[PDB]
Amino acid sequence: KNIQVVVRCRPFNLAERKASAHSIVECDPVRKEVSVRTGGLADKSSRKTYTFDMVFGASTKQIDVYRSVVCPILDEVIMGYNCTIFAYGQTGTGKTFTMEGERSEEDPLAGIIPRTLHQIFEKLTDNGTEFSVKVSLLEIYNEELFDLLNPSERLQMFDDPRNKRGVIIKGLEEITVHNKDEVYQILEKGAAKRTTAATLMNAYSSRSHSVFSVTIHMKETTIDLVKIGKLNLVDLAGSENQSLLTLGRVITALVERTPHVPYRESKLTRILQDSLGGRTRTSIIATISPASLNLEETLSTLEYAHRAKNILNKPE
Amino acid sequence: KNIQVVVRCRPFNLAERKASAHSIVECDPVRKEVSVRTGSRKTYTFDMVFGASTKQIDVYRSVVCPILDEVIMGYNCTIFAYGQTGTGKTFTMEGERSPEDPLAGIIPRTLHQIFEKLTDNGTEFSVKVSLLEIYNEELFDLLNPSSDVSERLQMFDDPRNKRGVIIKGLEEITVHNKDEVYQILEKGAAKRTTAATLMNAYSSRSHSVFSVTIHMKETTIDGEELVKIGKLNLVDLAGSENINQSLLTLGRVITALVERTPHVPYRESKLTRILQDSLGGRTRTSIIATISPASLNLEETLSTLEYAHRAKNILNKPE
Ligand SMILES: Nc1ncnc2c1ncn2[C@@H]1O[C@H](COP(=O)(O)OP(=O)(O)O)[C@@H](O)[C@H]1O
Ligand SMILES: Nc1ncnc2c1ncn2[C@@H]1O[C@H](COP(=O)(O)OP(=O)(O)O)[C@@H](O)[C@H]1O
Ligand SMILES: [Mg+2]
Ligand SMILES: [Mg+2]
């Protein structure tokens, strides 16, 4: 199916160890099942089991998330389509770790954004396509758009007369990427602007949607195609506002194929409408904690993910 | 005033540094002020404010010394640690043992000072301690060595005292030396862990009540013979992110005692009922509200300061 919903459980954090939290999550990648103990350790009946397209346990490496989730989407983007990958879940559960990763050929801790830019340059260089890569990074905080790549303030959004499904975010910085490695410089500039916004506007990353958009202009010739590909890598606000519920309803409507998809009822869904309403690949990575301490927010994340795409539990 | 409300801010933790969290709390010990940047600072005034650099010994001297003095005079006192999981309730109430330990909290320091003071002035004394856990309004004995994990304690009215309760079968361990407290705390932690695993009685969702009772007889020729009973309740509350009904009931009990309103609703939670004899009776009570300085915990920090402010409303001084 075009809409893929997957769950990634992170390892325990130090806060969870110090709080004497217990492990309440069991990840079965084979059966694509997540089970959460809501009762005693001898109360096996009081488990809630959820089924998804894929389940990544705490030991899952960055490269393995990339290969399973991103590779099929990037293939579609290179064919000249507009696709979106979301990271959804509680602050601290690994949305940013999944979407960007860390540093401290590819860094093993590299997330989807750096790996995607690496693979674009590798694949398009390898098959001799004529291509250019530009990237934008904007933040949505309190329903206002902030440009994280403008080296100089809210962005204005209006309808694209060329496309009913499109918007124009006027003056949005689109940085040309010249090499595979330049993504890290761009991410550093973004993080510096993100920090400035947190200090002065209280625009905390955990309370903001981050939309990283890569656009690829391609011309492919064979002796015997003009393509535009777009990938939106969306690091959502912590799931612990109305925009997340609107996104939920937009995804459910696309899975169940109902006539009315409420793109217009949030800035998030309006901005991504062109990359959602095209029979395109979309993936949601729901990130969760394994710890008893975060039971309520883990269950809320799994309920959200289940409501987005209802997959039935199979018999054991 | 007999009800003291203080705020203790912990240092940043690794998670907060790695997340590039911003400091959103300013602690002014001199002005007894905590200010939180809400983006527009919200300023709160308390009896004392301890910043991130505050040592364990300095919390003990400011908060506990005046209370223990009153307990030794034969009164019943309570100290609460209130706030978000990870902000240092247990660190404040028990502390830790490094690899008097500088990291020792209120419980070990209190037992040390009881033995030192009463030995020093030649008082005839005995010390007993109980440790119970309240989870989902049910009482678990953490010092009973034989009891089944699923065994709950029963509470009855004390016919000798309308304000008192009898917690039937509650283990009360005689403390023979200053150092024995650590062994007792270890036995408690082991029972706590067993209860978490089998009964889902998670420590971060439970109230811990450590009660020390001191029987004292002080004799002076040409002076008085004093027969005294002192009680100190050291209460490590459930994480405040849990707001249960019991934390709101405690809130209402403290507000009623500060504002001196006619009905104090002790009976509306097991926590406030158990501590009723040690509350309101013109005895010293202290609440230590623990907070994080980091942006990541803004919502729960504001909730803690609002709770603490609602318990004892002190007006901000002119700027
Ligand atoms: N799957 C994972 N494996 C290892 N560490 C992880 C994982 N997910 C998150 N982390 C770590 O957990 C912390 C919080 O992750 P972060 O991406 O900031 O969460 P979020 O963006 O959802 O608030 C960071 O230290 C990060 O490195
Ligand atoms: N004031 C403080 N100074 C130093 N470390 C602290 C302080 N408060 C808390 N900590 C540390 O923070 C962690 C969490 O504290 P803890 O006592 O478990 O919090 P709580 O009991 O409120 O959940 C522990 O590792 C503890 O040592
Ligand atoms: Mg993040
Ligand atoms: Mg604790």
Curated annotation (Swiss-Prot), chain B:
Top-rank lineage group of the source organism: Eukaryota
CC terms in the record's Gene Ontology section: ciliary basal body; cytosol; intracellular membrane-bounded organelle; kinesin complex; membrane; microtubule; mitotic spindle; nucleus
Residues recorded with modification N6-acetyllysine: 117
UniProt key word Nucleotide-binding: yes
UniProt KW keywords: Acetylation, ATP-binding, Cell cycle, Cell division, Coiled coil, Cytoplasm, Cytoskeleton, Disease variant, Isopeptide bond, Microtubule, Mitosis, Motor protein, Nucleotide-binding, Phosphoprotein, Ubl conjugation
UniProt binding sites for ATP: 83-90
Entry keyword Phosphoprotein: yes
UniProt GO molecular function: ATP binding; microtubule binding; microtubule motor activity; plus-end-directed microtubule motor activity; protein kinase binding
Pathological condition linked to this protein in its record: Microcephaly with or without chorioretinopathy, lymphedema, or impaired intellectual development: An autosomal dominant disorder that involves an overlapping but variable spectrum of central nervous system and ocular developmental anomalies. Microcephaly ranges from mild to severe and is often associated with mild to moderate developmental delay and a characteristic facial phenotype with upslanting palpebral fissures, broad nose with rounded tip, long philtrum with thin upper lip, prominent chin, and prominent ears.
Family membership noted in the UniProt record: Belongs to the TRAFAC class myosin-kinesin ATPase superfamily. Kinesin family. BimC subfamily.
Summary of subunit composition and partner proteins: Interacts with the thyroid hormone receptor in the presence of thyroid hormone. Component of a large chromatin remodeling complex, at least composed of MYSM1, PCAF, RBM10 and KIF11/TRIP5. Interacts (via C-terminus) with the kinase NEK6 in both interphase and mitosis. Interacts with RARRES1 and AGBL2. Interacts with TPX2.
Entry protein name: Kinesin-like protein KIF11
